[PDB]
Design a protein around this ligand. Structure first.
Ligand SMILES: [Zn+2]
Length: 94
């Protein structure tokens, strides 16, 4: 599986990811708010959470099989540290 050499985009929200969550069933990775808003948006519509990753065949995802991937977490931070978007925040308490 390969999408981008440098960067992480959620196939659902279609935006940068900050909290990558890996599944125990399949293994793919998605955004927290994404996998959280999806499962809640599906159930309410009498639906099921399926691998949103365009290309997968699986269609069985459970909130219980959702974990916080560290290997990916520290990775994303490695790019964010670069600081090339805002670079203008002087908070009194950090
Ligand atoms: Zn998958």
């Amino acid at each position: 599986g390969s999408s981008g050499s440098s960067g992480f985009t959620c196939p659902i929200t279609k935006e940068e990811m900050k909290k990558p969550v890996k599944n125990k069933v399949c293994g793919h990775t998605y955004e927290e708010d994404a996998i959280v808003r999806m499962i809640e948006s599906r159930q309410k519509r009498k639906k099921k959470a399926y691998c949103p990753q365009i290309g997968c065949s699986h269609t069985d995802i459970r909130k219980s099989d959702l974990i916080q991937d560290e290997a990916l977490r520290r990775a994303i931070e490695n790019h964010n540290k670069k600081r090339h978007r805002h670079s203008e925040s002087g908070p009194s308490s950090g």
